[PDB]
Design a protein around this motif. Sequence first.
Motif, PDB file in Angstrom:
ATOM      1  N   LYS A  94      65.789  27.012 -29.999  1.00  0.00           N
ATOM      2  CA  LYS A  94      66.423  26.818 -28.958  1.00  0.00           C
ATOM      3  C   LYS A  94      66.917  25.385 -28.486  1.00  0.00           C
ATOM      4  O   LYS A  94      66.409  24.456 -29.195  1.00  0.00           O
ATOM      5  N   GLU A  96      65.979  23.705 -26.140  1.00  0.00           N
ATOM      6  CA  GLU A  96      65.165  23.044 -25.212  1.00  0.00           C
ATOM      7  C   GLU A  96      63.835  22.200 -25.798  1.00  0.00           C
ATOM      8  O   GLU A  96      63.009  21.873 -25.356  1.00  0.00           O
ATOM      9  N   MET A  97      63.961  22.472 -27.568  1.00  0.00           N
ATOM     10  CA  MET A  97      62.835  21.725 -28.235  1.00  0.00           C
ATOM     11  C   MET A  97      63.309  20.537 -28.924  1.00  0.00           C
ATOM     12  O   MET A  97      62.905  20.107 -30.028  1.00  0.00           O
ATOM     13  N   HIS A 100      60.129  17.894 -29.378  1.00  0.00           N
ATOM     14  CA  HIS A 100      59.048  18.510 -29.930  1.00  0.00           C
ATOM     15  C   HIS A 100      59.037  18.429 -31.432  1.00  0.00           C
ATOM     16  O   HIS A 100      60.297  17.947 -31.973  1.00  0.00           O
ATOM     17  N   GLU A 104      53.912  22.675 -33.280  1.00  0.00           N
ATOM     18  CA  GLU A 104      53.261  23.422 -32.220  1.00  0.00           C
ATOM     19  C   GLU A 104      53.829  24.652 -32.061  1.00  0.00           C
ATOM     20  O   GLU A 104      53.316  25.430 -30.947  1.00  0.00           O
ATOM     21  N   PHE A 105      54.575  25.163 -32.844  1.00  0.00           N
ATOM     22  CA  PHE A 105      55.261  26.745 -32.989  1.00  0.00           C
ATOM     23  C   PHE A 105      54.392  27.288 -34.189  1.00  0.00           C
ATOM     24  O   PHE A 105      54.896  28.468 -34.541  1.00  0.00           O
ATOM     25  N   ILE A 107      50.778  27.797 -35.310  1.00  0.00           N
ATOM     26  CA  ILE A 107      49.318  27.565 -35.115  1.00  0.00           C
ATOM     27  C   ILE A 107      48.369  28.040 -36.045  1.00  0.00           C
ATOM     28  O   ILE A 107      48.488  29.281 -36.747  1.00  0.00           O
ATOM     29  N   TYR A 109      45.016  28.381 -36.242  1.00  0.00           N
ATOM     30  CA  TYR A 109      43.684  29.013 -36.049  1.00  0.00           C
ATOM     31  C   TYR A 109      44.006  30.184 -35.075  1.00  0.00           C
ATOM     32  O   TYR A 109      44.595  30.026 -34.164  1.00  0.00           O
TER      33      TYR A 109
END
Lengths: 121, 202, 32, 127, 29, 72, 144, 189, 125
Positions: A94, A96-97, A100, A104-105, A107, A109
Amino acid sequence: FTYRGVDLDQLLDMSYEQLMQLYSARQRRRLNRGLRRKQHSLLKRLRKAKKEAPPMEKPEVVKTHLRDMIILPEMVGSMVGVYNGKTFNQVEIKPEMIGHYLGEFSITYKPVKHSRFIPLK
Amino acid sequence: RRPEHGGPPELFYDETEARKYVRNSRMIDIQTRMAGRALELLYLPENKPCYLLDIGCGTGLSGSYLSDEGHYWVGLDISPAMLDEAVDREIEGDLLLGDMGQGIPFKPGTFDGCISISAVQWLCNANKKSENPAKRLYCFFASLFSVLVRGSRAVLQLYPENSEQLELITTQATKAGFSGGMVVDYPNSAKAKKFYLCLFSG
Amino acid sequence: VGPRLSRRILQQARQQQEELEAERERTTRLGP
Amino acid sequence: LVIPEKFQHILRVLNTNIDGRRKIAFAITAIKGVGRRYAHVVLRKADIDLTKRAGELTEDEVERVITIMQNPRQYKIPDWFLNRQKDVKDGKYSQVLANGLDNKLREDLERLKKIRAHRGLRHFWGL
Amino acid sequence: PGAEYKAKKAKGDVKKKGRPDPYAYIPLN
Amino acid sequence: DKLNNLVLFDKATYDKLCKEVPNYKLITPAVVSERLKIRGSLARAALQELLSKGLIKLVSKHRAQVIYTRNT
Amino acid sequence: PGVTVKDVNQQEFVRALAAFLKKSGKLKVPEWVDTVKLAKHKELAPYDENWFYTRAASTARHLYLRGGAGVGSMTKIYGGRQRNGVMPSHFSRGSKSVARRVLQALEGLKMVEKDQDGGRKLTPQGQRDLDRIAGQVAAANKKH
Amino acid sequence: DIKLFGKWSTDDVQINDISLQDYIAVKEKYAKYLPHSAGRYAAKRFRKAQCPIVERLTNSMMMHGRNNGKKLMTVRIVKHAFEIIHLLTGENPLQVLVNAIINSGPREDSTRIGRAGTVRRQAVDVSPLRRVNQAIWLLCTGAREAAFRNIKTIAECLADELINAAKGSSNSYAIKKKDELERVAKSNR
Amino acid sequence: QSVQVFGRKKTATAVAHCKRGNGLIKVNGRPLEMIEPRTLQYKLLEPVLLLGKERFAGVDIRVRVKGGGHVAQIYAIRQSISKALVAYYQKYVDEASKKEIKDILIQYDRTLLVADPRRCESKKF
RNA sequence: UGUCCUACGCCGGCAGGCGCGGGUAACCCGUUGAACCCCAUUCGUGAUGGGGAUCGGGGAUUGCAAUUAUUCCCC
């Protein structure tokens, strides 16, 4: 959509040297320290996937292990399958990142998911 | 170090120490959870509150826990200062003042349960020459066995400091005719280790 | 007293003696 | 000293009760968006004697303080002193205090939730 | 005396799942 | 319990401190704030004002404690 | 027979020098007077609005007591106890640029210049200035 | 003549208790300007009996954690307390201090004995040195936990506690604790 | 001619010069009454008020210090002054004055001639 | 203890940069100018100007890489 008061159309035209002020501190220092060649090859694969795909639906997914790569403003329109430890989580880019990362997209664990004695005699 | 080394309970738990005692949220938390464990300990029938002799209630926090679930109780205490502190807490249950070792002054076959909150480890030592500890414990246990309904349940929360005190209390209880035993909460622990005398008639 | 303490004491005494005994351009020319 | 005839105990700032039973450097600290240091630099910029209580403050003082609150940038403040100076959506130099701060944190959390990044999704799982 | 509930690798009181919360019951005489 | 010490001197308490601080036989901010139900900062400010008026004598100055005595 | 700064108490001498610098009016003043903390361990702005004059008197005192010390030693002097949260407290140094600007202001007052063997050293008329201001301090204090 | 703090005289100090001449060490030979002496007064038995009572009082507020080490604030506090007592009673604060020491001494208390579980208390006596020590500790506890949460300064609280202990009033925590000690001694003969 | 003595403490070491003069007392280039901890000022007044200020008007003393804390430096200063006066009145003045000064100064306090032999014990494995 | 310790000059309130020196060491950092303590102001019995957790944003530093907040400063 606008990012730091700058629209996407001029963001695509706005070049590499003056990316410094529109970012945060960390990726500014990372770009000042010298960008490597492996993520350039990843950019080349992403854009090669972007050319020959027909332009009326979303292009083909590009998969990698790179979790720590700075998202450029020109990433809008890609599909990134990022590794997490076992699988590839494939995600839509998107607009909006821009500020970033890819970590963080993806994970690494899973969430954690964790009767009294009565005497009779 | 310990409240038992300070002196007699009638005079150690005075106005100012009860005033600083009621303003202690840690005391509130430990008293409510020990009251919950004590209420869960006895096998009283559900949807039917029992007649409980609350000895060592003091400020009545365990009595407040009893009154919160709809149960009823009467309180026996030895210090008037923390009795007045309990009175000031708009408490519902009744309060009595007197020494529990001189005998429980109620009719036999009356109480369906007994709740003792930090009152049995007090009486092992003597603060007066006229008071015999063995005689006082035997009289208290015999009077408690007399006033209890045959088949009722008695739980006594305690923190003994050596095995000899437990030996004397257990031998007085087993010479008074009580049938039961000892339940320890986390015996290999230190902070969470509690001791619970469980008794019944027959 | 001790080694370090006496060393500090004698150093400070020598400093005070030099200071109380106290109360230009280098002569580059050999001949006037 | 003797109370003034116009002494107020509670002011109404940013639709919030402000206690006049406090120092002027700390009565304004009660409302969100301003702590002790921002209050000190504002009241030093506002040319106000700090020893005054908050209850004898005149009107003209409180609207000049609130006009410092809305647009302090023209009153020669350092620009890295602010909270929201480089916003992700629209980068502009600003300072949110009472309800703007709640909207800023709410839109940050809903932006993080919408993009399903690790931080916002962990915030969602945390509550 | 709670030997089934004492941890072998640690000092403390370890929980078991088949049995209820840790305790130790001894009778009187 | 919860104290309700005033934040500024009303007329009545100003009258009692006008006619009563010359006669307490002991002067410190603590007991003044205790018995007058007033802010201790106002108590110390009032005693600096009153020593500026000079009707109560100083004994000693310190950052934490100030002590005063009668004229006679 | 003349008095010395060492022969008078420190605090009233410092505030008298600050007052003399205040009514002197020839100090240069920064634009960041009321938005600065002079150390990283400071939590609040100083309550004294005219704290530059006391700062200037203090740094004149510390340069007169030991000259040849620059900005770094000055920041070493006014380091304090940093309470860095739940971490154990430590020692922190002062701000370099504030002391730098104050000492440059004293350089502009022809009270101090640089030294060939180190930091800054003060002018001899600085010694006369501190001498007669110590004389007036001793007149106002020791003769009263 | 040697005057304590420049204005207190040890010449008019008289010990009313006959048992405590050699334990309240404040006279012409014990007269010092300041309680700060830093003398090795605890490395030998009964040496602190020769210590001045003001020095033991300054060692007494040197207590309870954060105040350890900081005795200059302690002698500041006791200087302010001496000024407050002299302003209140109108005479030498040393007389009030020694009267408070005498009146707050536990003359008889209880010791704990027991062979197996049964623990009783036996009425025993307290030595005059321990009488002074327990009086000093009881005034310390009264001064510390007297106010502890309001505007009441430690110096004026200590002055009030010393004055009320010298007068023998029941307001003193030290007097109440001492009286409880002899009463529980009488209860456990 | 003059007399140099030294005063010792845990880590505070002082030197003292006593000579002829009009009665000037100087410590670290400063008079004795403005050492920074004011509370122990009577300690700085313990020796001279033990002897009488009229007698000191023939001796000028200057003390320099290095090491230790505040109160350790104060104790070093007062012990150095006391030993400076007794050495000055022993070497230059007759033995009776030195004897009476020593007697009164030893019946007042013990540390004013020989300092307290105390130091921190080292830690060993 | 050191070729990472840094003296000093310039810029930015601070986090930190730039430039030029000293040091392979009782020589330069460094008369190793530290904290507690001391003096004066403000605060004042108030979950409060105490306590700082947990958060949001910005900036800078360290490095192939900092996201799971490496670290610091500010709000």
